[PDB]
Amino acid sequence: GIVTIDGPSASGKSSVARRVAAALGVPYLSSGLLYRAAAFLALRAGVEGLLALLEGLGVRLLAQAEGNRVLADGEDLTSFLHTPEVDRVVSAVARLPGVRAWVNRRLKEVPPPFVAEGRDMGTAVFPEAAHKFYLTASPEVRAWRRAREQAYEEVLRDLLRRDERDKAQSAPAPDALVLDTGGMTLDEVVAWVLAHIR
């Protein structure tokens, strides 16, 4: 089946999901590669017009443990998705609600099993997932952690604004197991998630 790991910004969800997918021996999936594909295709085609292009070409995300692939009209584009120009354009495309909906439609076509990570994987995309988790922590601890890697106050202020957006747009899935990660190492969180997957 499907494991969803959702959480707010600076929640360590991507690192936890990669470790959980590796432990289970299934692919890790996120939205990043699809946003990059949309940007690359918009650039290559020289493009509402973006969505007609994406839908028109036919895009598929292939979930593979060694590294996911993105095909457009049957062509593997994966290796072309990390250029500076894709980097510039992807920031902008990710912000379009219609592109977000398109990414969701493509994720929904990926057959299980996999560990999907994001904010709304267990609600907007895979509400039928058998194993849903929401990793939460106070904004202070997430800021404290991120600041170790700006000052605490700068990061905290940024996180508070991101949390406000997240809360106004979504809530954890009702059947998701919620874990406050405060006080736990990455290993502990990974272990906790796996201990809860029957």
Residue ranges of the annotated binding site for ATP are 7-15
Known binding residues are 7-15
- Tell me how far the alpha carbon of residue 76 is from its chain's centroid: 21
Return the H-helix or E-strand segment holding 5: strand 2-6
**DSSP secondary structure string, 51-66?**
HHHHHHH-EEEE--TT
Convert 111-169 into a string of H (helix), E (strand) and C (coil).
CCCEEEEECCHHHHHCCCCCEEEEEECCHHHHHHHHHHCCCHHHHHHHHHHHHHHHHHH
Phi, psi torsion values for 144, nearest 5 degrees: -60, -40
CA–CA dist 167, 132 (Å, integer): 18
Crossing angle of helices 32-45/49-57, nearest 10°?
Answer: 110
8-26 burial code (b ≥16 CB/10 A, e <16)? bbbbbbeebbbbbbeebeb
Residues 11/12/18/21 CA torsion (nearest 10 deg): -50
